[PDB]
Design a binder for these strands. Structure first.
Lengths: 146, 63, 49, 49, 79, 147, 49, 209, 149
RNA sequence: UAUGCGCAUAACGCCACAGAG
């Protein structure tokens, strides 16, 4: 039966003044950017993974923790908290996957200006050129001994 | 009901056409592609989306 | 349209004769399945199998 | 009044990975949280009880 | 070198081994086992997988480009 | 949760009450005279006895999953699973003496059962876990109303 | 609203498969996880563990 | 004033002592467990009167491999710090052949002095911290995992086990708060022990870019 | 003999927990010779039992005194003599748990034994000197008959 | 490409309404 502060609004280093009254070891926040700028990126990763669980747990829905850990490990791959939209797909290696997602003409224009190479290992890029996708039954090849 | 074994193809893309009155094909769209990637069946997508829509043979200069 | 069926197994689907005499499979002819394919060729495109 | 699409694989590779991988028997648990999603429904759970 | 991957055949490998071998028996490849009246090449390929009589090599590509070779005889198959 | 180190242990457990004797000096640069005496003792008064304080304050080893590959090394399970199997081993050891009609099962073959099942429950190489994670965030979202 | 979200998440996370070293890598070799789900296990098979 | 600036100086001394121990410098147990009364005994009270001056609190820790690389921690007097102060600090470092310092400002530096601290060579590695972000050790938080900097022999066997390039490994920024805590150069790989909930502990790796 | 237990019981209560399954009454009984008490589900269409009924309860491992052959296969055609010819209500079920209390002293004068007759349950609790023949997964025959006094 | 008997005929989009799950 502990007592908990709850503020509508965020200033993480403001609460560091009051380290003798508040348990700042267990500070939590909704803003993943505030946690990413105060406690690092590996803390913001656990904030993402906990926030998606808190979204689904209002409705009695339990998504397994391994899915959330993979999604947060992807969105925090580059040291920053990146969105899953057409501005985070600019970092992608494959121009064809960027074209098949959104604004195909802008990514086509960037790939033509930069002279971009596609290694054809994305699942979208293997299906544009009619090649068997690398995941699943395509990570390997079969050889016939002579 | 409708069933399409082979038939007419779109004159731009050489994929089957849509409609059951024109005796056409049904889509294997994007979410079906996604859910069949999740199975790990890659030759089954290669079937549905390359051998049974448009397998053409182009000529390239290898140089 | 789908309808229920209990008297097929759980891993089964019920295919009508409308579709079964229209959907084909390209079975190559080997010496160990030529009797089955030969009876299937004799039956023809409107008699199942 | 629901409708369902029945795709018919035309290669031995597609057949062999539809028997092994995408079979109904292997889809017993949902990938969301590993809980079952094949099970009996309405009349059966009354008469079994 | 020493092969450092799984000794078990994964579920994605037996699908493609049975697919390739049933496509071979779809042509007139010789059958290593005794046909007990089967006409389906998948059932014959499953009997050949169970009897450890498939000679195909799985080349397991690692994501740098490197590989290592496994016969299906030296993989542990399960149900 | 507490901190470790060779010099930290040597100053903590050993030379605290020794430097608790009076010294009567000043802070040179942010340091007490007791800390300067412990630095002097650590530098000169130790020679290959600091190997003792070095090895008695080494870090915890990495988990087995990062050191030994769980697909090719048997019993290389998770730490949570090892805790769970140890608790169930202790709790199951009581029921073979208390509860009647013992069932010809041992501790070690039960541990081997659970460890082999943990090894066989791994993801096979090839599994598109990103599509599964995407479709597992997206499909329950249809059962979530708006505001 | 639920469809465009799932589309965006799929078009980012589609390249992530488990390799033969047990690392979840993107299609360009970028290592996202060193073990899948921080323990390496499959969700349908952790149910009786 | 008093009894509040002494508390702030006690906390930002304790935090930089924990920082210097975590980076691997020789810090005693009494110097880590220094209570506020022991701080009023060692250094003075009444900083407004000036018995603790911020010049008087400058520490010099030394590293446990050899005592050739020791590090200053400066607490500068002026609130807004310009290049005129850090030139004096570099002149203090050049005498005793110090290759690394750490300036704890109380309002932020000017961006010209920021570019000056970057603009020093490998001869002078100067870092800067706000006082406000040293009131608590961020690595003691429950979400912050344990970060371990790796030697170049461990990075080699890392990239050899997975047959991996440093271009493929995940990133951590060099302005990340825990990379600034552990003082990590760009190009070094940081081993991270996550307190996982599905596994017990989980080893991941990130490169500093 | 293959008799595992034999006593004369007396119905002290009927359905105390108040659950009232159709065609089934739970009889909480209590013994005469021993410290035993009984909880028993009986079929009360074919064999009704009232409060205060005194009945003779026998638990056997077989129905044949000429050697415990222990078939378990059911021939209705066998007109050979049985134990069941001297009783009125006969069941057949499996012992699914036995339990007691012990703290380094085995079978310390309390030993429950839970028997299920195809879903009609039964515990037979008392001193463990009478509960020896029971073990888990064993097949037993209940054989009860109302005594007319 | 489909139908009919190598031969003869037919070789589509865009809006807007309405509907199914």
């Amino acid at each position: 039966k502990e007592l908990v502060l709850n503020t509508e609004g965020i200033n993480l280093p403001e609460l560091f003044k009051y380290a003798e009254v508040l348990d700042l070891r267990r500070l939590y926040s909704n803003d993943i950017h505030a946690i990413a700028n105060t406690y690092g990126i590996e803390a913001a990763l656990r904030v993402i993974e906990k926030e998606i669980k808190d979204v689904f747990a209002v409705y009695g829905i339990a998504v397994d923790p391994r899915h959330l850990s993979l999604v947060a490990d992807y969105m925090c791959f580059e040291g920053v908290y990146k969105p899953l939209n057409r501005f985070g797909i600019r970092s992608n290696s494959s121009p064809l996957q960027q074209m098949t997602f959104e604004t195909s003409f802008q990514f086509l224009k960037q790939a033509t200006m930069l002279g971009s190479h596609d290694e054809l290992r994305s699942p979208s890029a293997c299906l544009v050129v009619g090649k068997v996708v690398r995941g699943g039954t395509g990570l390997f090849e079969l050889k016939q001994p002579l | 009901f409708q069933v399409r074994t082979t038939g007419a193809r779109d004159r731009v893309t050489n994929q089957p056409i849509g409609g059951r009155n024109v005796q056409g094909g049904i889509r294997f769209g994007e979410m079906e592609r996604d859910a069949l990637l999740a199975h790990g069946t890659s030759f089954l997508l290669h079937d549905r989306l390359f051998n049974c829509s448009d397998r053409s043979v182009a000529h390239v200069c290898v140089k | 349209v789908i309808c229920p069926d209990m008297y097929i197994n759980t891993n089964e689907i019920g295919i009508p004769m409308v579709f079964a005499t229209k959907l084909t499979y390209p079975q190559p002819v080997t010496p160990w399945n030529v009797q089955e394919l030969r009876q299937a060729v004799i039956n023809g495109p409107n008699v199942h199998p | 009044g629901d409708e369902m699409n029945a795709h018919f694989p035309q290669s031995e590779l597609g057949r062999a990975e539809a028997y092994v991988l995408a079979c109904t028997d292997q889809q017993y648990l949902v990938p969301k949280d590993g809980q079952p999603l094949a099970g009996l429904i309405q009349d059966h759970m009354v008469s079994g009880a | 070198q020493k092969r450092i991957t799984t000794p078990y055949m994964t579920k994605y490998e037996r699908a493609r081994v049975l697919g390739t071998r049933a496509l071979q028996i779809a042509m007139c490849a010789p059958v290593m086992v005794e046909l007990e009246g089967e006409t389906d090449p998948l059932l014959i390929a499953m009997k050949e997988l169970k009897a450890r009589k498939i000679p195909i090599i799985i080349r397991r590509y690692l994501p740098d480009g490197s590989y290592e070779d496994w016969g299906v005889d030296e993989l542990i198959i399960t149900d | 949760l507490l901190r470790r180190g060779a010099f930290l242990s040597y100053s903590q457990k050993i030379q605290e009450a020794v430097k608790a004797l009076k010294l009567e000096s000043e802070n040179r640069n942010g340091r007490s005279p007791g800390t300067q005496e412990m630095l002097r003792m650590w530098y000169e008064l130790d020679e290959e006895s600091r190997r003792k304080y070095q090895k008695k304050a080494a870090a915890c080893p990495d988990p087995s999953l990062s050191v030994w590959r769980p697909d090719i090394y048997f019993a290389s399970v998770s730490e949570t699973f090892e805790t769970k199997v140890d608790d169930y081993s202790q709790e199951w050891a009581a029921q073979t003496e208390k509860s009647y009609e013992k069932s010809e099962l041992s501790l070690d073959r039960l541990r081997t059962l659970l460890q082999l099942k943990w090894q066989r429950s791994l993801c096979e190489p090839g599994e598109a876990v990103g599509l599964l994670a995407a479709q597992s965030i997206g499909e329950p979202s249809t059962q979530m109303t708006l505001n | 609203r639920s469809g465009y979200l799932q589309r965006c998440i799929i078009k980012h996370l589609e390249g992530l498969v488990v390799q033969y070293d047990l690392t979840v890598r993107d299609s360009d070799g970028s290592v996202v996880q060193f073990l899948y789900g921080e323990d390496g296990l499959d969700i349908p098979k952790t149910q009786f563990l | 004033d008093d009894e509040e600036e002494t508390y702030r100086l006690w906390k930002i001394r304790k935090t930089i002592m924990q920082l210097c121990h975590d980076r691997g410098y020789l810090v005693t147990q009494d110097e880590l467990d220094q209570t506020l009364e022991e701080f009023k005994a060692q250094f003075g009270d009444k900083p407004s009167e000036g018995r603790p001056r911020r010049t008087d609190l400058t520490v010099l820790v030394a590293h446990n491999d050899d005592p050739t690389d020791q590090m200053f921690v400066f607490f500068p007097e002026e609130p807004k710090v310009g290049i005129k102060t850090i030139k004096v600090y570099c002149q203090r470092m050049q005498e005793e052949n110090i290759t690394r310092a750490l300036i704890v400002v109380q309002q932020g530096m000017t961006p010209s002095a920021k570019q000056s601290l970057v603009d020093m060579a490998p001869k002078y590695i100067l870092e800067q911290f706000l006082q406000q972000e040293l009131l608590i050790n961020i690595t003691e938080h429950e979400l912050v995992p344990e970060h371990v900097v790796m030697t170049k022999e461990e990075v080699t066997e890392l990239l050899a086990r997975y047959k991996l390039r440093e271009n493929q490994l995940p990133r951590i920024q060099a302005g990340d708060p825990v990379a600034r805590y552990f003082g990590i150069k760009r190009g070094q790989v940081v081993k991270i022990i996550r307190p996982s909930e599905t596994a017990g502990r989980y080893i991941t790796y990130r490169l500093v870019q | 003999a293959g008799i595992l237990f034999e006593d004369i019981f007396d119905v002290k209560d009927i359905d105390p927990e108040g659950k009232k399954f159709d065609r089934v009454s739970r009889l909480h009984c209590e013994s005469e010779s021993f410290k035993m008490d009984l909880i028993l589900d009986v079929n009360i269409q074919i064999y009704p039992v009232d409060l205060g009924d005194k009945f003779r309860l026998v638990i056997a491992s077989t129905l044949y005194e000429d050697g415990t052959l222990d078939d378990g296969e059911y021939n209705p055609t066998d007109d050979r003599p049985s134990r069941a010819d001297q009783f009125e209500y006969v069941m057949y079920g499996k012992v699914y748990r036995i339990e007691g209390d012990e703290t380094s002293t085995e079978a310390a004068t309390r030993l429950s034994a839970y028997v299920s007759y195809g879903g009609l349950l039964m515990r037979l609790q008392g001193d463990a000197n009478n509960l020896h023949g029971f073990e888990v997964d064993s097949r037993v025959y209940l054989l009860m008959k109302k005594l007319a006094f």
